[PDB]
């Protein structure tokens, strides 16, 4: 029937309002935000050419670093930063093709579908070796905004990444299944994280990159040992706030 | 004593959707308080129900959120939307954006039309929903043969039209390679019943905003990933 969209809200009707019909609803709860985001989606990739028993040193090789920033939003080395930082845009890895892969790391499924302005959750991370050669790797998890501690080994022939009280994982051997998974709690000093844009600066002289919030991540993962590893994120107890537009899709 | 175990044939497999958790490596940590927050929502369906804009074609093939009507009654529909959450006309509505991440839908669809012409402009439209089987309606005579509502302009500016869920199956696909009887469900066409009528000093063309959203009993199910594309 008639209404007035200028009110900013109109009723949700079913066929019975204007016609001789009945409501036809069936129970369904797979649209719940928690359920939807509670599944693992590819969100990053990591590569290392250093052995386990050596000093970890930040490196990049064809757009792959040996450490990542834990955030569904695009991240990459920004203006020669030592470690990857959150990006404000996505770029093709290739300077010519104008087709993906992108040089930036992110959870494509999150970027392409995040109809909210802020989110809150714990993060379940899965790290998988891209081939079947027996794994021998050490990973260090650094909480949001904590010291990276990219120091020298304090003892000969030991993985510098394991030289910490920070949570770290060590998998190696013929009995392992070439992967690692674990869940970390939300560690940002922010109450909720911005899911798309942050309309401001991060420091007091407003000289940072406008659009990026301060400490808006889940920490970092540093890796040593040989191999290329893919990473997945799974959002536990996910909560979202303030509905907002989704990424635009080209007209068919 | 140790427990005997039978290692299943899928040892070491990483299931991206297993309904189970993994090992907590930094527990006993407080999640930074956010009790002051507002605007939280828990169901993606909430989004589907917010009316957002349909993309209509310009005379220059440019996309606009409305269609034109004037002092005449064309023998053809002013606009035609195929009922599919795949329709290109609704490709950028929140409804379609959410539906792209689910396999099936069920329930009502709400097509909202907002008359933006002058207050001195009057007229009547016939909004029709034609179920499939006999093709698209070619005339007003045919369009009236199906589900329809007559929209009369006046004090109230908009008309909330519902495309009833009429289907051979309980659920319908949100997308498809080729149209099937389970993924394409007919057409919504709006006709000019009486011409837009008005006094002198009033522009001949009136613009009617067009929006879509899920109705009261609308639901989606089966989380999936849509065909990827390069933004541009």
């Amino acid at each position: 029937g008639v209404d007035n969209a200028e009110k900013g809200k109109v009723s949700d009707d079913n066929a019975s309002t204007d016609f001789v019909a009945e409501p036809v609803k069936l129970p369904e709860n797979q649209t719940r935000v928690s359920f939807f985001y509670d599944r693992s989606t590819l969100s990053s990739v990591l590569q290392s050419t250093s052995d386990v028993s050596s000093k970890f040193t930040p490196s990049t090789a064809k757009n792959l670093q040996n450490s990542i920033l834990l955030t569904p939003l695009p991240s990459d080395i920004v203006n020669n930063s030592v470690l990857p930082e959150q990006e404000r845009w996505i770029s093709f890895a290739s300077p010519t093709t104008q087709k993906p892969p992108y040089k930036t790391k992110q959870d494509w499924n999150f970027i392409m579908f995040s109809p909210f302005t802020y989110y809150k959750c714990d993060l379940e991370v899965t790290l998988s070796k891209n081939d079947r050669e027996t794994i021998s790797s050490v990973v260090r998890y650094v909480p949001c905004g904590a010291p990276s501690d990219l120091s020298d080994q304090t003892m000969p022939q030991t993985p510098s990444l394991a030289d910490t009280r920070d949570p770290h994982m060590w998998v190696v051997g013929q009995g392992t299944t070439n992967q690692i998974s674990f869940v970390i709690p939300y560690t940002s000093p922010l109450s909720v994280l911005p899911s798309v844009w942050f309309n401001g600066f991060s420091n007091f002289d407003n000289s940072s990159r406008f659009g990026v919030a301060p400490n808006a991540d889940f920490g970092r993962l540093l890796l040593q040992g040989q191999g290329t590893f893919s990473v997945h994120y799974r959002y536990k107890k996910m909560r979202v706030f303030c509905p907002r537009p989704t990424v635009f899709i080209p007209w068919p | 004593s140790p427990f005997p175990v039978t290692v299943r044939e899928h040892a070491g497999t990483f299931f991206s959707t297993t309904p189970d958790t993994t090992v907590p490596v930094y527990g006993n940590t407080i999640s930074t308080p956010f009790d002051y927050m507002c605007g939280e929502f828990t169901d993606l369906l909430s989004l589907c129900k917010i009316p957002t804009f349909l993309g209509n074609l310009d005379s220059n093939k440019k996309r606009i959120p409305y269609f034109s009507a004037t002092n005449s009654t064309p023998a053809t529909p002013l606009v035609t939307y195929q009922v599919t959450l795949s329709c290109s006309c609704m490709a950028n509505s929140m409804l379609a954006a959410v539906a792209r991440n689910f396999n099936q839908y069920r329930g009502s669809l709400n097509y909202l039309f907002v008359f933006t012409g002058s207050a001195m402009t009057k007229g009547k439209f016939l909004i029709s929903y034609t179920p499939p089987g006999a093709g698209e309606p070619k005339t007003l005579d045919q369009a009236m043969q199906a589900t329809y509502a007559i929209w009369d302009l006046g004090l109230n500016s908009s008309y909330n039209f519902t495309v009833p869920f009429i289907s051979p199956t309980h659920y319908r696909q949100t997308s498809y390679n080729t149209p099937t009887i389970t993924s394409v469900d007919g057409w919504l066409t709006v006709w000019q019943l009486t011409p837009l009528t008005y006094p002198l000093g009033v522009p001949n063309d009136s613009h009617i905003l067009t929006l879509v959203s899920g109705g009261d009993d609308f639901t989606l199910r089966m989380p999936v990933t849509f065909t990827k594309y390069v933004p541009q």
């Binding site: 069936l26 129970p27 | 309904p19 189970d20 309980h170």
Partner: peptide, 24 residues
């Protein structure tokens, strides 16, 4: 048929099996 484990299924019934529902 063909299920003969005495301890209950580890995954809840909603998840282990599709949910049967009547539309009427």
């Amino acid at each position: 048929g063909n299920e003969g484990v005495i301890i209950n299924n580890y995954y809840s019934n909603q998840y282990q099996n599709s949910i049967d529902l009547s539309a009427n």
